[PDB]
Subunit: 351 residues, 4 copies
């Protein structure tokens, strides 16, 4: 059987910069469109934005800000169970907001989940590097079996086989993304990954047939990518780098060459793990952006504008009807502003 | 439930831009100086050259519109001013020598009031400028202007699809403007993620517009004279330039020394600065910047036309109709683009038509 | 007939940096291969390369050294009729070596050629921006009629139909290249051109039916490009930028930031056209690093060809033209092809 | 006129063109097997071979490589006496596996004799063009004299060359024409085949004869090695990623507060000391002891095989799938839009 040998290089992948959204007939202004989205009856959002579960991205103050903006925050797991449980309770006491918490496939996973459920968390996030693993699937089964009503976000995966496997396991929402992270080196050190736009589209295609929403995680640098991700089949996107510079992100502002910066690093980086192994991430920094409200406004505003061009009144019409168009690298250069000295920065370009 | 066929066509379309192709040479019986660059937009509108200056606050006002018209082209006076002022600019150009002049109009409730003054100032064409030309507000506005002014030249845009062009034409538009996101100072494709590669956009719109005997305008993306030849060869009747005109003397704005030499301010109309003056929080779709000073407009126009004449000479095109209907392209890679530009040599002197 | 409108973006073109020559079975060592080429009964070269007819590339001194290496030189036409016919004879009297001279499509074209024939050139180059035009077509007919046995090299062209046109006009050698020049902007200011390698392959395809040789003109920056051009069907290549740093080339040495340089400019540049706000140039002017004698540069070029032919197993250029295969690669391949992830300490005699 | 129309048909791929597609896994990365068997006389515990160059592999490197489960190839830019001594030096350092480079020359068989007497485990017939009649005749000459000897001949990049070379009597085929970090062969000769395609085309032919192949050149990250192995290679050979370690020949030089070591191609002017070089000369960063580089290399392999659901290198060789991407894909694959503060032990 040469089926496997003769099909090693057949597949093709696309990402955000390979593609443009084709404008269609619009009977709706950007301010008129609806950006609401539903993961489940117990989990509904006013904006399709979820902050990443990372030690440099989301804690108590970040989750409260995201929820009050209409989004969701996933509290990272690089803390004790008691700490994460009382961080969830802190967010819930802050006005009955929505909040999530990250959990890993370990031995104390169910022990941590108990406290999170005891803290009345809305959704736990089973975060692993390879979501198509047997341990992950088996772990999801244990959770659903004990908590039939609890929202379970399982990831990360990048194929249809993996999405189906987790859906049958019992996951309500499937997080998609192997490699596209701004601080990720998984595709560099392991040589493993799938281009994000193709990944989201492939995983959605399977998940769309189960009534299962998918999360576009990592890879988004501009507002336009979020629109591309949602139109590719995603119900909601997850951001790390664009939320790291935000004031409400966990961290103290440092100074580099006079400017204000915030520490942003991978969970698979050396620094994050220590708090010798082979890292699948790096340690870096992003400019301080101020309050979250300004970043959200630029992001959501870009989505509204994008939905307006496609004639999409709401997010579902976008997924069902939006058409992309492929372009070369030369098209990307035309897409970006070109051949002009940039006097000053825009609040949506670069960040 | 549903059975979606649109789902499997999400990534089937692919688009080309200027740096993706080259014009293939052909048998030629005409010298570059012998060719014709004249075009017809409508019965009442005719240009000797395929150049139109963009309706931007940093590109086209009276002095620009006058200079452009005297070169054989057309100038679209921007709408970032009062209705009276705009009508005054249109009058100033019309009086100068019976020169042609255009005016930019947005889809507002003030639109008809603005157009009334423009027509009274004897404007030759109005441009219905909007980020999304395939919109109801635009289409409905075209109907309303065509009804009240049955003989007024209406330029409608911007669109990037064939269905949109067809929609504008049936709304009563004389000319269709094509270009979503290729602008030098544009970030629409970056902040909204929406667009079509300009050469593909121009070509597809021209395919639909051909059916109705309607001309189209290639707007944005042009950074060299060769790009203009491609746009016209793609099927466009006329090109619209913003960045190559902004550094010209007649353009609005004073000169400023940056990086050791003279520069002129050039910004996108969807940028912060270009809208905070006509506002009294937004998400911009353009940036603010500056382009190098290039002196009188005549020098720029001569380079553009000359490059067009050479390109038409390589193709054997005695006129622009033969160019649109006969010219062939050839798709190349990024490696082909590097070969096309000068390479492996330190350029010591600045060329009139390069960098 | 909506065919012409629908067949607008069908064609795809390849340049040198899109392909690699696939190695083949070899029973011949690189030093054993034959690099000799036959353009005509009267024009035979030991090595397959010609110095371009430009005012910063080829005059008498360059033409002589080029011919002593087994190549050919084309005296540029940026000089009076007397000046060109003069230093053509200057080459013709430094041995029995060969020499060429560029001629334009003017009202006094025939007058210049007559002086060159009296100076006894081996080949004239009817050179123009657009070879596929009646002005050039009827000019070749004129020369071919007056001089039945004169080697006529017409160009430039980039399509098979154009190559066919020049051959039937009277040209026995066709020069290929519309815009791949290093000092060229024709592609940028006119939007016109064909990716050189595909241009050579298309032109050679048609020209081969008539037994007519093809010159791969322009677009060569490394010796590997030459091997690809010859393998693409070309008999001989023509160089400009690689011959300008050579001492024998016209112009004097300029020093920039501690290094020696020599002026290299396009014949369509503003500087070239001024000598002989007006016109629109299709070329630029600049400088290239001084290389020294022609012998050193020409040794690295042929050496690359000999190695390249050895990999493909070609004993002579004919076997290379008839059998050598390519393989396309993306931008990721091109970067792998060049040195990478290693900080170069010294310049190599044949790399950058 | 079929050979004329065939010229521009083929398409090639390299490491930066694709990504490995993650598959269902029941295995942890630390549990996977990275052992490999080239021949019954030559078995490696890790799929890493130190390249036979004068800036990469000598006695000190070959010993350190062998103790990690890898292999070292002593370069032949030295006398027959010296190379045989280096071979004997590694062998008397605990009976470690050693390899030695041999070229196609007059003193070829003479050199091989001295290496055989020094009990070399494998000889590498290292040539620029493996598909030449000279190398083929040389392999035939060597195999006839030493039936039980391991012969690694190269380099090739086609299935034709691999077949003709296996028929010559070689046990291992080394693949790679031009992918080298210090190589200019594709630039100066215009000849080459994209490594990942070359490995695939060669391994396709080779496995029909049950013959292993070496992926030689082009690797800049551990992920590339995983790709090379998943393309059909039994084992890879590294130059630049080893030239900076402490066990490599050459001493640390210093430039602007960062340590470097010399690394140049064997086809460069320096290593060949008019000559027409097919390589350049330069320097790579100093990376301390070999065990740190190797740890990252293998650890990255285990991660890859983990994602692919591969329990051993044979599974990865027969089942792993690739997905093709553009330049934008590669941009997304590497970190982006974030100013890297400190360097990872496995990333630049
Ligand atoms: C998100 C992420 N990678 O994408 C990450 C986060 C923390 C640690 C790590 C580390 C431990 C460095 N990498 C890691 O666990 N990789 C890995 C690779 C392959 C498999 Cl099969 C597994 C696994 N345990 O399933 C894990 C990775
Ligand atoms: C020309 C241009 N964009 O190309 C532009 C000009 C001024 C403001 C703007 C701003 C206000 C920033 N954006 C804007 O009008 N966006 C937009 C997006 C989508 C739609 Cl459907 C619409 C619309 N109302 O047609 C407008 C854009
Ligand atoms: C080689 C080359 N251009 O690529 C060149 C050389 C000298 C002058 C020129 C100038 C005069 C600047 N350009 C030029 O003659 N271009 C040109 C363009 C199109 C045609 Cl159809 C013609 C022509 N007369 O055939 C010439 C160009
Ligand atoms: C490894 C390598 N090239 O990849 C190399 C090593 C040393 C010298 C050389 C030199 C001498 C510079 N080149 C070389 O042998 N080239 C070459 C080219 C073509 C052939 Cl057919 C041959 C050959 N005789 O096999 C050799 C190359
Ligand atoms: O250390 C890492 N290695 C690989 N992926 C990571 C790592 N840390 C975070 N990620 C992923 O990348 C996402 C953020 O990527 P970003 O949106 O490009 O900033 C996170 O939500 C995770 O899914
Ligand atoms: O701010 C903006 N955002 C997006 N497009 C713009 C903006 N302002 C002007 N444009 C378009 O871009 C064109 C100029 O493109 P350019 O000639 O390539 O500089 C104008 O004629 C408009 O069609
Ligand atoms: O100014 C010019 N414009 C366009 N092509 C030129 C010009 N000058 C020289 N060329 C062509 O470019 C060739 C040199 O290309 P190079 O070898 O890549 O430097 C010449 O032999 C001519 O065919
Ligand atoms: O100078 C040379 N010219 C061409 N290839 C070379 C030369 N020197 C070494 N190589 C090859 O390149 C490999 C190293 O490439 P790297 O692993 O990418 O550094 C070696 O193992 C050889 O196969």
């Amino acid at each position: 059987s040469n089926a496997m040998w003769e099909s090693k290089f057949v597949k093709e992948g696309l990402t955000f910069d390979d593609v443009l959204l084709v404008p269609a007939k619009s009977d709706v202004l950007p301010r008129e469109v609806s950006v609401k989205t539903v993961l489940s009856e117990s989990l509904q959002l006013n904006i399709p934005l979820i902050s990443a579960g990372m030690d440099t991205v989301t804690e108590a103050d970040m989750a409260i800000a995201m929820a009050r903006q209409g989004g969701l925050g996933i509290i990272h797991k690089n803390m004790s169970i008691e700490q994460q449980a009382e961080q969830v309770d802190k967010v819930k006491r802050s006005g009955g907001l929505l909040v999530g918490a990250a959990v890993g496939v370990t031995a104390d996973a169910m022990t941590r989940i108990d406290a999170l459920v005891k803290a009345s968390v809305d959704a736990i996030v089973l975060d692993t590097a390879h979501g198509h693993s047997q341990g992950v699937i088996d772990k999801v089964k244990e959770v659903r079996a004990k908590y039939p009503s609890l929202n379970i976000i399982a990831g990360n995966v990048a194929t249809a086989e993996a999405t189906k496997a987790l859906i049958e396991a019992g996951a309500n929402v499937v997080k998609v993304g192997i490699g596209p992270g701004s601080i990720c080196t998984t595709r560099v050190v392991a040589g493993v990954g799938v281009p994000q736009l193709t990944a989201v589209y492939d995983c959605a295609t399977e998940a769309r047939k189960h009534g299962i929403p998918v999360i576009a995680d990592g890879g988004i640098k501009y507002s336009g990518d979020m629109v591309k991700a949602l139109a590719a089949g995603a119900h909601v996107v997850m951001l790390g780098s664009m939320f790291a510079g935000v004031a409400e992100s966990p961290g103290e502002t440092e100074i580099y060459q006079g400017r204000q910066f915030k520490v942003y690093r991978g969970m698979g980086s050396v620094g994050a793990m220590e708090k010798k192994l082979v890292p699948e991430g790096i340690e870096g920094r992003v400019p301080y952006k101020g309050p979250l409200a300004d970043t959200v406004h630029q992001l959501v505003g870009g989505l509204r504008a994008g939905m307006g061009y496609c004639g999409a009144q709401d997010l579902e019409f976008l997924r069902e009807n939006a058409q992309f168009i492929r372009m070369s690298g030369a098209g990307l250069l035309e897409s970006h502003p070109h051949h002009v000295q940039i006097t000053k920065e825009a609040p949506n370009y670069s960040l």
